[PDB]
Design a protein around this ligand. Structure first.
Ligand code: CU1
Length: 178
């Protein structure tokens, strides 16, 4: 169980907005993930397997832990944070740092549609971090190259595959790429 803390994952943005907007107004915007941003857990094997199209942001309800709130997708719905193209660091926070096989990071394609549900064919792999099966916290921050051919509203998807289960954690990040 864990989430991407820098940049701020949408899930983690939910937990944050709970503090500023209150429980009801934040849950209206994000769903029940605001209480458990660490629980965006669904089947591993992405992109060939894993959560279905339209259910990637919520990891298909976090396998019963959260609702489908994160699967809403419009140009205006989610808080964007500025990111510059090129090398960037991605830092996960773990509430339970499980044995890990790999992490893998995707960005939306130049022509993606921000007003349609997320589909796996809108995403392109930008880097893989292989791990030895030790706990996730032996490598907290990853250096990933974010394509420089691309700007405006994009989504970075980070995926954390758990070594000893059939699950993974899916964290979408809303970015304004300069
Ligand atoms: Cu966990």
């Amino acid at each position: 169980h864990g989430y991407i803390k820098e940049p701020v994952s949408r899930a983690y943005m939910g937990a944050l907005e709970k503090q500023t907007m209150g429980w009801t107004a934040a849950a209206q915007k994000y769903g029940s993930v605001i209480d458990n941003p660490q629980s965006v857990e669904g089947p591993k094997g992405f992109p060939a397997a894993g959560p279905p199209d339209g259910r990637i942001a919520s990891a298909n309800g976090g396998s019963g832990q959260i609702d489908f709130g994160l699967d809403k997708q419009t140009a205006d719905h989610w808080v964007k944070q500025n990111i510059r193209g090129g090398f960037n660091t991605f830092t996960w926070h773990y509430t339970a740092p499980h044995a890990t096989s790999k992490w893998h990071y995707y960005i939306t394609k130049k022509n993606w549609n921000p007003n349609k549900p997320l589909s796996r064919d809108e995403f392109e792999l930008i880097g893989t971090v292989n791990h030895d099966g030790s706990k996730a916290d032996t490598n907290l921050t990853h250096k990933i190259f974010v394509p420089t051919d691309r700007s405006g509203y994009h989504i970075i998807l980070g995926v954390w595959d758990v070594a000893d289960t059939s699950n993974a954690f899916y964290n979408v990040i809303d970015v304004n790429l300069t």
